[PDB]
Structure formats: C-alpha cells, structure tokens
C-alpha cells in the first residue's frame, strides 16, 4: 500500500525535523542576551500627519529614497506622498476599490497594487504624457491578492488567497513561477535583502522560506497558534519575524530552523497586523488591533515603547531605508510619521 | 515666503489633488453600497439581472439613487480575512432559494441545502463587522417551492414543522426560521421579500429597504435617534 508507506515516512520525517531542531536548542535568544543593556524607553513623536484618504488605509510602502510613500485605501486610490513636505505627488484612481496591498518599486518607476479583484496592477509613474497609467495587469491568481513586492522593475512577487505565491514577469505579463505548499490563504510576503529568498505567511499558522529562482520551499516554520498576518526580515537576512492573530510576534532563525524568541504580553489580546524592524534590527515594531504600535526590544522581548495616536486599527507599518522614520497607517484614514 | 518657486508650485499641485479627492469623496458618499451574498446558486443570478475572476461589481440607478452592488461570491477563500472590508455598506442582500428545502449539498449528501443556507445567514447576520447593517433577504424560486411542498412537506428539513402543506404557511415558517437567527433584533432589521423568481418589484423592494436605512442613519447624524 503506497498510501500507507508514504504516510509512515511523512510522520517519521516530521519527527526527524523536530528532533533535529531540538538538538540545536542549547540556548535561547533570551538568555544569551541577558548581559545586554536594554534599549531603554523609546519615545517617538509624530512629526507628520498625512491627511487625504477618506477611507480605511490598508497598505503602505516606503520608496527607497526614504522620502516618498505610497499608500492605498478603500477610496480606490493610491497616493504618492512627499513625507518631508506633506505633499501629494500623485493620486492614482483604481479600477477596483478593494485594494489590500501596494508596493513601490525600488527604482521609483512603478507602483503595484490590488486586492479582491485577484489582479496585481502595475502603474507607471514616469510617463511622457505626465500622468500615471496602468502599464500591466497581472491576472492568474484565483484568490484575493494579499501582498505585492517588487524584486526589480520587471519582476513582482505576489501572494494570494488561493494559497499560492507567484513570481511574475511584468513585461510578458506571465507568471513564471508558482510557489505552492501552503494550505491556507497567504497573508504576507517579505523579501530577503538580496532578493533571492522570500518568506510567506499564511492562515496555516506557518511560514515558509522560498527559493525564488528554484520555485521551491526550503524551510517550514511553525509556532503560531493562529493565522500569520505579517512578516518581515531581520535586516541581515538570517531571520524573520512574524505577527499573528494569537497576539504574539515570533522571531525565527533560518539557519537554526527554529523559533528563537516570542514577543508577547499579558495585556495584549489583539492581533498583529503589521511588523517591521529598525536598521540595526534592535527594535521590532508591531501594529495591533488595539490601535497602538508597540516597539519591542528585539533582543529581549521587552516593550521599549508605544506609538499611540491612531483612533482605529493600525493596518500597516513601514520604516524608511535609512532608518530615519516610522510611518504608521490605520483605519482612521490617516498616516503618521514618527521619529 | 521661504519656499522656492518650484516648491510653491509643488504645493499648488498638492492642493489641486486635495480638491479632486474631496469631490470624489462626496460622490462616493452619495452612492449606496450593497453587499450581495447568498447560499450558492440561490437565485442570486436572477436578482442581478433585474438590478443590473474576483469581486464583481454592478451599477444600478433607480429613483435617483445610485447603487453599487458587490457580488463577493466565487471567492473560495476565508471570509474572516476580507469580509471586514465591507463593514461600511448600507445593506446586505442575502439570497436564499426556498425550493432548496428538499435538497442536499452535492459535497455532503446528509447536509440539507436549506440548513447550509441558514448557517451562512447566521455567520453574516451575527458577524461582528455587521452589527448595524441591515439585511434584505430574498426568498427565491418560490413558484418551484409552492409546487414541491404539495409532494414533499417541509418536515423533510424541518421535522418540527406542524403546519399544513400550504405555501403561505410553509413560506412563513421558513421566513421565521431565518429571522430568528437575528441575535441583534433591536439593532438591525431584516427585510424579507418573496421574489418568487418572477416578480419585477425586486428593485423596489431594495429601494425601500434602503431609504429606511438612510433615514435611520440621518436620524443618528441629526442627533435625534
């Protein structure tokens, strides 16, 4: 019986992986870090409030110049903002208002977005005509688009509610790689600093490390009790953090193939909607359903501070590439920039 | 003062963008958003003909209201990860097809289609994101109902039913079974209409449920409710 032989190997293999990981558990982060001075209290202030959206903000993405942002809301609009001056640079009407994700290309030439239309639309921000236009619509997913990230101007990585992730060739409009293996809706993507790997999170309460060029899952990380809503990479690319509906964040090390640290508190029963790291990786920031963003000391799991100031669910966080500022967006229709 | 000629121009452009965002805001505010749900192939596709891969939008105008209907079916994904984006709607239109009482789900021979319909109704009706959003419930394929019940009494799916095999009573029983799933009767209303898959007043039914919702909303904004 082929079915039983394969099921028996799968259980044995699950046990080998579990033990291979226990074999590496000679420390936790939380103990090697006992002799590290705490970051102390981190008190950030709102420096800018970006007003203009008339609806819940679902997505944010900082451009690479640390000055421009793209934000998306249920207004059916993307807004390109000048974070220093509080100016609208562009406002882009969408064909579908049901937008859940957006992304700024590293070059600043393109903006991606989409959501319940199951399409990732790519907008060209730099045209001869002087207007932002759709250059390409990428269709193929059968579920909602939960997250977009650009690798370069011709490549966009998407994740969706159809349980898969995909790598698209923007110029041909074709999907070149399909990344399968999740069983639940995929909620988020995070690209490695070198673009070669990406980590996806899903409603499987698991996250997977994918090999972008191979179209292969390399590592599966578990530990959450519930759906993972947000993922980001630790700046050097060897770890990632994830946030879920079980109201915790978890740090995972890719070489250890283990959960390294849990960030939680007895008074938080809210899900995590967004996670990000500061440049040194010392601070972990997370947006919560309680309308606050917590700042965690990533090497201790202490709460370093709180960014309070939204009147509704924090839907998204972003940190600039130069580390100068943190932007938070929320369901109260505002974006705020903190320093 | 302070700003360069180009920075001043950039500010002027930003201000024009704000004016345009506000005008679109006002237009959107006037439109009526309707979420269209239903128990699979429950006559949903007939209602949209009269009220004419991902989410499908339908635009419709009647008595100067501009309606926008969102058909969110055919999204075989978890509602808990997207249904909240529809929190801000005027009403939910929910389609149930009464002839379903003697049917079972293709995927589960022991699961009555009508109970599957009630389970969905309850998941939406008592959802935390829709606690003040009214429901317009349409009972479809009534002509088919009315004839089947003369051969197959309701008990088939409602063993406790003790009325006659009369569609007026059987239909009332089904209506009650759905209205009693409302655990927030003092907050959200359920408007029930029998469309029979033949009526032409289905548009009017939505219109009137909608104007009643709008007046309650104005009474709340006026500080009267």
């Amino acid at each position: 019986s082929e079915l039983d032989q394969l099921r028996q190997e799968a259980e044995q293999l699950k046990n080998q992986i579990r033990d291979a990981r226990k074999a590496c558990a000679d420390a936790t982060l939380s103990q090697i870090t006992n002799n590290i001075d705490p970051v102390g209290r981190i008190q950030m202030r709102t420096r800018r409030t970006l007003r203009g959206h008339l609806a819940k903000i679902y997505a944010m993405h900082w451009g690479t110049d640390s000055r421009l942002l793209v934000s998306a809301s249920q207004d059916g609009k993307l807004i390109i903002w000048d974070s220093y001056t509080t100016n609208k640079v562009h406002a882009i009407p969408l064909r579908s208002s049901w937008v859940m994700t957006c992304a700024y290309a590293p070059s600043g030439n393109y903006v991606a977005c989409g959501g319940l239309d199951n399409i990732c639309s790519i907008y060209n921000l730099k045209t001869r005509e002087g207007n932002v236009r759709v250059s390409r619509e990428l269709a193929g997913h059968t579920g909602y688009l939960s997250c977009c990230r650009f690798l370069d101007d011709n490549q966009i990585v998407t994740s969706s509610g159809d349980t898969t992730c995909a790598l698209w060739d923007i110029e041909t409009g074709q999907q070149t790689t399909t990344f399968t293996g999740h069983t639940g809706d995929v909620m988020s993507l995070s690209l490695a600093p070198d673009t070669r790997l990406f980590v996806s999170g899903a409603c499987d309460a698991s996250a997977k490390l994918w090999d972008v060029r191979e179209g292969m899952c390399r590592q599966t990380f578990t530990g959450h009790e519930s759906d993972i809503n947000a993922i980001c990479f630790f700046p050097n690319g060897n770890a990632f953090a994830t946030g879920s509906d079980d109201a915790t964040c978890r740090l995972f090390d890719l070489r250890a193939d283990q959960e390294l640290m849990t960030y939680s508190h007895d008074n938080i029963i809210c899900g995590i909607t967004s996670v990000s790291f500061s440049k040194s990786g010392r601070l972990l920031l997370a947006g919560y359903d309680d309308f606050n963003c917590n700042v965690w000391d990533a090497l201790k799991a202490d709460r370093a501070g709180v960014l309070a100031g939204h009147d509704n669910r924090v839907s998204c966080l972003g940190v600039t590439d130069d580390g100068m500022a943190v932007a938070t967006g929320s369901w109260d229709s505002f974006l705020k920039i903190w320093n | 003062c302070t700003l360069s000629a180009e920075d001043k121009a950039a500010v002027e452009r930003s201000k024009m963008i704000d004016r345009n965002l506000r005008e679109d805001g006002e237009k959107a505010a006037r439109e009526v958003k309707l979420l269209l749900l239903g128990a699979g192939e429950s006559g949903k596709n007939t209602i949209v003909k009269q009220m004419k891969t991902g989410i499908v939008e339908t635009h419709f105008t009647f008595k100067d209201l501009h309606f926008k209907m969102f058909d969110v079916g055919a999204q075989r994904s978890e509602r808990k990860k997207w249904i909240h984006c529809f929190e801000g709607v005027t009403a939910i239109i929910f389609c149930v097809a009464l002839s379903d009482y003697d049917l079972v789900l293709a995927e589960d021979e022991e699961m009555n289609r009508m109970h599957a319909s009630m389970k969905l109704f309850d998941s939406i009706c008592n959802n935390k994101w829709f606690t003040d959003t009214s429901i317009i419930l349409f009972l479809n394929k009534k002509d088919l109902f009315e004839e089947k019940i003369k051969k197959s009494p309701l008990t088939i799916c409602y063993p406790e039913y003790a009325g006659s095999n009369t569609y007026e009573e059987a239909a009332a029983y089904i209506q009650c079974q759905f209205e009693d799933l409302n655990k927030r009767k003092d907050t959200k209303e359920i408007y029930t209409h029998f469309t029979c898959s033949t009526d032409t007043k289905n548009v009017q039914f939505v219109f009137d449920a909608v104007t009643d919702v709008i007046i309650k909303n104005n009474l709340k904004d006026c500080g009267l409710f």
Partner: single-chain antibody
Amino acid sequence: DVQLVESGGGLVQPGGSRKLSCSASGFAFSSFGMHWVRQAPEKGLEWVAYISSGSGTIYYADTVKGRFTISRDDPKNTLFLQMTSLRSEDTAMYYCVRSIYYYGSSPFDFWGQGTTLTVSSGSDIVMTQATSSVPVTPGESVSISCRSSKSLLHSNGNTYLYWFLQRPGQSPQLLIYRMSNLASGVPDRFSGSGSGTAFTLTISRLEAEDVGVYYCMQHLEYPLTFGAGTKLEL
C-alpha cells in the same frame, strides 16, 4: 508623441495686437504649467509668462506685464497670449514650454517649435555665460561655464540651475535640471556640476549632434532668467 504647436504669428504694425495660440496634444495638458519663452533675433532667450496648472497663478516678465495676458483653455488643450500694444522690441520667436512641478519632476522638458512674431518699426538674478563661442574638435571634451549673481542653492538642498541646448533650426532641448540631473533622452555624454554661484556643463567626447547654443537658466525665483548662451562650434 508629445506635441506643442504654436500658431498665430505673422506681421503686425506697432501699437497693434495679436493673439498667439498653442495647441497641445499627446499629453495630459491640464496637469502641466505652461510658459512662454521668447527668442530674440539676437538669439537670447527670455522668459515671458507663466500660467500654472489649474490657472492658480500667473507671472509675467516685467517688460510684458500689463501688456500681454497669458491664458489657458484646458478643454481644448490650448494656450494663448493676448499681446496688446506691440512694439518692435517684441519681435521674437515665441515658444510654448511644458512644465510640471512635483517632487522629482523635470520642468521645461518639452518645447514647441515656435511661431514668429514680427513687429514693424531690478533684483533679478543675472546669469552670465561669459564665453560667447567655443570651437571644439569633435571627439574631444567641452567645458561650458555659467555664473550667477545670486546663489542658486536653496535651503531645501536644491540648486535651481537648468541647462538647455538649441541646435540650429530647432527649439531648445532640456539637458540638465537642478544642476546635475539629466533629462530623459539625454545621453551620458552630458554631465552637470558646480555649486553656489559657479556652474559647469561638461560634455565628454563631443559628437557633431551636440553642436549648438548652450543656455543657462535659473529657476529660483521669478522672473526666470537665462544667460547669454555659448555657441559650441565645429
């Protein structure tokens, strides 16, 4: 492609008036500010007037202010200059210039072809381009300098210097904006550098197609001003 066509030029007697028109096509006209720029028979360029997008603001050069009126009609994609009490000093080629302002934009990146108006019988920043002409053997580099009477460096970090090239028989082309940014379509043979009040346009490996007059413009304050222009020769 992007197009601006000037028309309505011709011969007028002094004291009379004309209306110049400029038809735009190929672009989102209503989103662009527009300028009129004159080129005298002496070939210096002079800014005449600016109409912002949305017609929020209008600026005029002091010599035309009160005489010329600049207007826009977005639904037909056109600009106009209503020119009253024309004097012979007003003889020039009149060009429409497209300009859009936002962070990271490239203003003055498209010029029309101009129409010709022939009329019978301050605290301004002065840009000076000492050299009038420079012969350069093709294949060798070029250095074109420009000085300003005022620093063009604003406290926001931007230096508002623009360089334009006018090839014989052609309207001016933007080469460099804000000191060092190349305009789209401009080869990497061109490079800008400098600071304060001293600026340089560097050309590496000159091509025959690069021969024409190089104009220096400041955009720190209105009136916008141009330098004399250095003619590259050979």
